[model samples]
Target: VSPFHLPLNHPTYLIWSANTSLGKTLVSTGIAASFLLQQSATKLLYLKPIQTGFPSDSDSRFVFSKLDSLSLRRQIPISISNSVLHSSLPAAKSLGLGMCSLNFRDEKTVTGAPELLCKTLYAWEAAISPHLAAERENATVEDSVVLQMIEKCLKEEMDLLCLVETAGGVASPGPSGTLQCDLYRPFRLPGILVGDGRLGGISGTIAAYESLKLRGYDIAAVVFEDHGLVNEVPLTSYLRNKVPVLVLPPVPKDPSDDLIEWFVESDGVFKALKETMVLANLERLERLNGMAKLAGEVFWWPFTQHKLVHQETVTVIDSRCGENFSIYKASDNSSLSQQFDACASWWTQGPDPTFQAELAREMGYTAARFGHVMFPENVYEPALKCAELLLDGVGKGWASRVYFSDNGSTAIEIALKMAFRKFCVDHNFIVVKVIALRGSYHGDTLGAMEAQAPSPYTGFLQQPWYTGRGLFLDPPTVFLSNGSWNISLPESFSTFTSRDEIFDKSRDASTLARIYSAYLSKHLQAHVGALIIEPVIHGAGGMHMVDPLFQRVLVNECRNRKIPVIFDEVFTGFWRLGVETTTELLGCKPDIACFAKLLTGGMVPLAVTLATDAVFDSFSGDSKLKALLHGHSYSAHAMGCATAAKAIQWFKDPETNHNITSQGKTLRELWDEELVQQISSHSAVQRVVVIGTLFALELKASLYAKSLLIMLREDGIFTRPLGNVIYLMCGPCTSPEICRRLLTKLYKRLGEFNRT
Candidate 1:
């Protein structure tokens, strides 16, 4: 009955998630603050499973971070060496960032002085005072050791113990215990789950909750962040193993509210008032022809349904807003904008890609993506076409591919099947096994998952068809722990081509080459097939970059070895490298190039797999069986292809490419000093490498989803978590201003991370 409930009534686990930037943090902070402010003495065990960006000392994120920071020990131990802390994922993940912080934040680092952070908790202020000398010796009994410390700070006799999970981000696993959320087999107390409206909020939350439920954890409630107004988030209860769901209202402060308030308060708001508002104010409307002209309509009376009643509706409606001669047209133009705006609104969840694609179509660009076409094209084609022609050219470049029964994971799956099937066919039938990079990832599609079975890409789904049969290789980067592709290529490829001695060691190129060559030699000797690699940028493998020269070496080797070199450019294409195509820019033309994201410039739904003449030739075998047997209802999809064409053109445009180039440069500069030095300079950050548009620092983090993102979001910058290395790679569509704001804010976030 009160505005919000206090967690003290029950030891609570508050879970909040939704589309990024819905003010989930503020809502979380407010909930914590409300309870902390109104309730009796209680230790609100504030443990953010994640933190993103930087922390701003303000009402927005202060309570969230301030309260949560005290619990850092719960996730980590003081006795844990700073050396270990340096190499590990930040105690908490932030925004899908597998962030590892090697730089110590305590006394010996920058300023040995104790933190000045204090807050008005009760009638007095409590400041954090830690023994600067307390190394891992004092901290590490284990990760849960800090939980005991949190109890010491916030847990009081009979006080409610609250644990808050962190935010969601692109490509990020939820929190430190995200996997554990599924594996947590026991219930210490009641719990809840929150998920951001990304990837799949309901599904993700369901996974987290069900994982807990399966382990027999008592789930209190699963709340989706509403942020004040109740959005029609299609969250049915009975999800997460039939667990009930409690929806939270939207956060009180939405940016749109500010935009609206500013509009209403501006004196200039009424500059066009006579024309736009007169119809609403009928008497005052008499002086304005805008309304008089409407009343003067002869067609107004005839369309009136309930004569007098309808007349009121007729006179009130604005045709400018699309009511037409039905008399609704003259009433107001507000509906026109309203409907139009709704047509282009950002989605929080559901089959969000559908709306994303539809908006693209409405804007004259084609869309290839999953989900239904919520908006009808016939309903708005002329406008859409006009917009497209202005951008994508007059014809053939406005459609995009939209896939159903297929998620992005499936798209990669399809690409892998195409890549390998073609390769298998190309090789003679000697039962060839592909050599996949040890940590590289393709996707979760049947084929892609099968390929990624050697890695953790498929999670627990690696079984039966998805077993890891392919020989694994390390990412071709100098910073990795193992051998480099550049160093091993000449010999490795030689073994594969000659089918002779091991390239280096027994597990060397010979064994790898023998297995792969047998796989390829069979195709060359028996059937035919291709060898796929996520060239240059290996997104799943930490955005790892393979030099053009090394890639070229592999390409040449595959060529001589009679293997079609397939490039899984899915995560890095369309100027992702701050260049055109990774292959073209790298000068290693892959037999097939798989692409998806940033294809619409991040505005449409579409994907593409360009094959060289040889790869295409296999499909052109003329035999129905030999033909590329892939097809989607949306295949060669009118929408997706159009969007792709437009995207391609957009990438070539000076205005767009210039923006992308500058944005990449800005990110690099930010990385070089702020992120690079923070990671590389630290004893924990082993090496920092900047390539094209991505920069990754290899750290000692254990790949736990740390709360680094929670810190980033607090500072208003977004980033992704990848393993122990927090890799931040922005899409080409990122605007120069956003990049600057993001990084500038990020620097401050790092400072906060350092201090905390």
Candidate 2:
């Protein structure tokens, strides 16, 4: 009494229908009917979805209907879609299959003839676009369409179970290069190679075995026939015996139509096959029970992305004044202070002296400390001063006493969590819409990354939900006829006059004030409590600098709306350009400001998210209640704070400020408008944009950056190729020798490139 019944979770085999000589139509039909006898409570589909090499004969439909009736009679009910394209027509097929003729569609063909077949599936998606609720019409990887579809089918209770491909055959010399072709694309189920007795056919099998061996699959076993040994012989020996063999059994020399009739012709074969399949069904039943027993879960891991250069030796002829080291070497790892724990632990006491006597100066620490932990005494005053400096810079209306984090993105997450959860508890509304400027980057942390950013960058994050959305507007660009990339102050720029106009409009007096006011009103109505912005420069999108007017406009608009504005100055801080103007020169005071990367001269990974006193007051109801709840273990580092204090004092020297304002002028002049015009005018160059010390050049293709970067590396000058935008970005650490070498290398390479 082999039941021949499979549980819903049974791994189905649509290829070989048991050793009982069962044809696909009959076995497929019987497998579909097993649910009728097995589970009376189940309502199921008995569909033989795609039928090959046949027209939809009415008698066949009658046969399927009869099976359905038997299920209904037994209290179980089975139904299949009438829309199932039974007569050799394709219904649901993966676009990767490239068999479009079955569905009938057309497309401009690509190099591979196989892709031409993808047209039909694409058309089918277009046809059912209305019913499939998804981010895009039909599912594609972009919107995670396929991921959702797979998730749904395998979701709770296997809501829509599927019988996937058992369809495969060892590809010969002329493979379709389609589904399951070669080892490059393996079918989920193991495959078999079938062939006639001809020598050519046997030769193809041997070739397939070698290919699979190269692909590193277990050989399993090679079946063959023996000449004198009657029943069987080893496949290798059969070939040596002057008789060809196959990985699978070889066909007969004068074969009757019963060639594959093992399932039908042999009596015991039918029973044995049924018994084997019954055991397989029981295994499926056990797996289904196990999978259903568990609770749902979401697995996640912390991830980060930062620019790293491969190691290279460098010699600096002109190091900054009072330098002990001349030929400084650089590497990928961040400074040790960023990761040291003790320096940060000492800072946890805040103003308390118990923590001071015990942890020393760590009570007031605000930055990372690597070697500073070795100093057990006298580290307090510097720590306190650094803390005050960092807190005061957060501006008057934000959280004045904020903890520092190790990275810009993490600091943002801490601030956002404090704002969001604290607001939910205090206000009873669920508004967390963080307004962000177009092309802004908030590091790679999910919470901060969710704020607005450029679109294509989102793809780099495997989880699209983590990135969320933002209101984007392109950064302002000014093209000069002067043929250089840099902007000239006295040249009277043609495209930039409107820059001042928008800044004025951003003020309350202009129409933009009303427009922005309304937009903020709507977002607030929806319950938004804060806005996140990267001030001065949008780093990842492009090195875009904010004009003084635009900064003033944003600061006022956000403050007037009562929306907390967070300025991310991770890249712009630590004086990469000019000194003393993170807020002052940018034109207005900000409620909150985040700083990192170059805080210790780009050597440490320390960041701080500072808020003004007013913003901090929002969570001051009761310390016992813990109003604002967000923290990282290494939030305040004594060592980093110590280092920051030392660095700040170092920068206060008149010479440091001189370098900022003075060398910057020459840096700007090197990429002046004439160079921009030179790059833009050349047919090989696509576009060029520059700001202060940041020079950006976009070419036609991605590989262009790779080729040009290698060329630069060989010429004793180092710069990164950010895809197609080749740039030479340097800060105060840059020297005359380095700059001269960089410029010369760039010119030589540019001279060699041929135009399209």
Candidate 3:
């Protein structure tokens, strides 16, 4: 019955009834019996936490009777421990041991082994739903207690099998009005829906299963009683092989020979159940593998070298939660593991599954009514509310208008189009040239590509399609010296060396602004349209950290020349750099700004370009061509807009913000201070940079970093390198533990490298 080649832990199954009298208890015992028979030394726990209306017919009482019986041939020693409030018995024989408990109460008072207690801590005796029953007794149980109990139990026995039984149907109310499905959602157990064989059972079973699955619970099989009319065929037919349907013949009032035989070691119902679980695991496992392979063949992957597709292993991601990806393998196997999301899924969020599901639910509500409508004159609530939130949250002072787009590249392009058009229309200069940092990657679009010197993303193809015109400036280099942050000036700005000399905000601005004056002086005849820069950090251009002071000076310089300063914050915005926006961190306000990536918590494709009232006014005219004629069919998509709203709202919540800040500090401590101090002086390590959640170690040899990276992948800590720079940008939701482990593992690997 033991399933093999499936990685991670075997999930414990919860037996939930579609309705009352659905044989949930009997089916659970049968599975327990099967487990006991198959494994010679097994530890099984059967839990029925809340029982009401039938003290004598309690599920735990029934389970205890079956275990205590002689069973004709197999005999085992049983030890019963009855506390003042809790009772437990250890059954031993072919089975290593079994522990069972039931807590049915009328008051909130509850106590049990720390290992055994759960929200089922308190219950009531009324025949009504748990919520009404609790009200009848004036008793209360929080949803948190229930979740905590389940988590503690599961973690205590990560390797053991425990069958949890839910009361009534999947949507049955708890002590509060919370549905049982949602209450137990923290632990989305593999489920077996117990269906009664009575008339009117099929519909109930399907409805119950739907409710469970809607909340993301995996239904392994549908186990139902067979009473002629309510047989397995109807369910199997309707399910269409989505979930296997197994029929259990009516159980004898007593624990009979037939029942024991049905659950015995081989060829019994338990074996079938075990096999079903194995297949279900296999099915779910293959979805990622199939998707990954199918994508390689049909989908044109972005930024990939398709010629070498057959050589490199494709990462098959099952799901991403928080800052970890549950990755799987293509070869039929049993093991799966999590890798710290160092890339943040392309620099994007509180993406724990539950958070994403909440976003999905919000999106679903909006998606139901018009997935998207036009935005020119047609208005929608999501877009309106989202725009309001951004203007309130992101729009500091002069940022008075919001424009929607599809992604960061498009977002940047929007800003570019606006900058070029408005500046040209406003200033009326010929041969326009925008000033940008030398090693910057605004985006891949032609309008975005034109703003930077050619890089690897566009350098190879030589961008035959690109006709970008921009002037590049050598950006100041920032590094830590003896624990103090310092900036060494670029060749052109050699006079501005010391950190104090450049960073002093009150300086005559010549140390920074006059340098730009030198470039502008050369192109005095041309339209130096805008001063575009990625604030504080340049992502995708090898994770370069630009000096914030230099940026402040540059913006001031550009604005002094009446040039609009555009901050490409697409990759650094929305808590990616441990702040709301890099604009606040750098203490500069741009005439135009763009944001994406983490904008919707990485759940949807949405982008926004924020502009001042001045910029918006330039596009506002009676003539149609005078207006920015830019719009997508799906612009301001209801679903994307709704998700973006919720994503930002989470940051607005104080508690979520606290978690983000705490995790950022932990990562900084590990990677920035300790890790950097240890490795910066290493002969093989240089160009170490750290700010907020971003850390980069420029290797003296790419061969060493590559060698180190391969080992990290095998160990399940996924990260990527840019040229010789092996960097880690920890997502805001990344755990302190993951950060610690990542550093520890890499340090050990680097130790080996040093030895060689």
Candidate 4:
């Protein structure tokens, strides 16, 4: 039994050279021998896909001879094993190492035969280049064909360790005149770059490694000869901080059977190495640390006070999957570990592996080749499917269609555009003034930034080119105090408290809305195109949760006064607050709804503005210019569409433990029965508010939110705050167990703060 079986899932190592004379072939033999030596049953493969030069000079023959000699020299009783074909070898030999080569001695038009690439064939005579040799014989081999052939071998051969030796340097031409790197990119086997050990090898080695690294190949280890020239030392020193560099003893000037001797001796190096990239997670850590440092220099972060954040506070995240992020600590620069995604990583679910796979499958299908190719004139399946699904899933029977955009801010921009377009269509004869609640935050885009009423972010939004727009109205703020809910009316409606009728709906709500409409009628008359509301929750503008009863009355007044309403549900929508839409809780649907954040279950960026046909129709006309000219280059991207569709389904699927409805019940129950109760019990709490899945505590102590965040990090609870208000807005899928633990921790942490 010359050949043995290896699981098809076994990882393959790629042996690449930095320069032509690099010992890629020799290293391949040693690595293959090491695997076979350690595990007698290991079926190792030495594959030299395209052998150049002479038949007698074949790297495959050299590797085979070295393996045969090493098997005899080791003499570890393998031949006497009962599993082997008993007493077959006259001299001890490898029963596991398989040799495969595709040789083209004199290319001679190897002729585009589909099966020809799989032939155990090549050994070119001239040591020139693959391109020159192919040209001499007028032949060609496509990178695609070579790729298919490699796949076929992995599929059929089932070898445990396959070491593919590339022809020349990484950038050298293949039989197809394609760069070896370009040809091998499809498989991109974990790379082991063999660097030349000569005097000028350092630059050549670094160049080759960079070329492969830039092309997304993870160079696992760099192995080079440690000649007296000291090429290996400097090269190793340079990449030492970045990647592991292994040094091999120098090759003697022509010791007889030198290859065989090196093969036996090199076993120790390969065996000492980590088994595989996946098993050795340290390499992944190095990647993240390097990237975090690199990105600091290369990319500029948004909303970050960069100079202050410099290097100390910047936490390097390796990867995130599930409700937590595996982040590296800044103090000691430790590897990745558990950190609860308290802020949900910018309101994203943070590291959803299943969703990542779903997105990858969608991207594999076709990344919506031409998404922004005039959504008005043409349509794509994913985009159309996404629109159909969103309208039905999130629209609550109020929205007739969906308009795609990049994110919440832009979604708001599109919603505002639709409202402005509708005003133009209605022929209302006044300067359109948008109405929004004071302290209501929408987004960061100029359009959304302008739409926001006075808030903390306002000073930052002030620009030389920026103009503050929109009329502000103070909305009703409610809090839970001593077991009863209290309402704090604005100065304009001070009568609610002064007249001592803060509890009634028929008179109080009706009178508030009626007077609000009258004020609008007198002040902005016929000019109020849209009333933008953040629904029962106003996030980003200071953790204010409005009264549901107040929201319904406000919408009622807007409906009666013929003002089109826009719900800026970017942060509040998508089951973030227990229901399908906040409108379901508020008991009123708006003319337009802006949604994002949890739309893709915290994976991809996608936003949709759902509109009533009334508003949609305003954008349509016989003229092309009349239609809404809106959308982005990646608008309705197939990957994002697939991600969002699956996320919505996850919410709707009753079988899923992460279902929004079930999770919402658990969250609301905890927020009501456990969370607020604990917070309200604390004397430091001035106000404790719980609305649906939302929980907020307005601590009497100033700057406690910041200090509390620091303290919580010590306990691994990932959370950020809105200044004095420390709140928790659980995603629809946060587990009930996690919810309780998080609440208990917060409760205990608050007790510490109260003591302080």
Candidate 2 per-residue C-alpha lDDT over 373-446 given as tens digits, one digit per residue, 9 for 90 to 100:
32222445555667676554424334466556778788888777655554454555433566666677877777
Q: TM-score for all predictions?
A: 0.42, 0.45, 0.76, 0.62
- Candidate 4: segments with Cα more than 4 A from true spot: 1-296, 330-333, 350-374, 428-430, 459-461, 495-526, 657-672
RMSD of 1: 24.7
lDDT of 3 at 292: 68
**lDDT for each candidate structure:** 0.40, 0.42, 0.66, 0.65
For each candidate, how many residue pairs have backbone atoms clashing (under 3 Å)? Answer: 118, 33, 7, 12
- In the range 1-756, model 3's lDDT, one tens digit per residue, is 000122335446778889877778777667655454342224555666565543333566565555444122345433211111221221111112212334332222123211121223333455667777666656566776555555555555452356778887888887767888877664455778887677888888888887776777888888877677855778888889877788776655674454554434323555577567656655665565577668778878777788777623778766554566766664634344457766566777446545655666676678788677888787788899889888887776768988898988888888988787768767753587788888888887788888987555566475787755777877776765343455667766653333334345564455555665565455433568888898877777767667776677677767877788898888888777667676666677888999888888887789999999888888877889888877777788888888888887775454554445433322123342465566555566666666556666677756887786788776666787677877676655544555666666666676776842
Specify the poorest-scoring 10-residue window by lDDT in model 4.
Answer: 79-88
Runs off by more than 4 Å, candidate 2: 1-379, 391-399, 418-429, 453-461, 464-494, 497-526, 545-551, 656-658, 661-683, 700-703, 733-741, 754-756
Candidate 4 residue 567 Cα shift, in angstroms, is 1.0
Q: Which regions in candidate 3 have their CA more than 4 angstroms from the true location?
A: 1-21, 31-190, 195-208, 224-241, 244-278, 282-299, 309-312, 330-333, 459-462, 495-526, 660-672, 679-682, 735-738
For candidate 3, what is the lDDT? Answer: 0.66
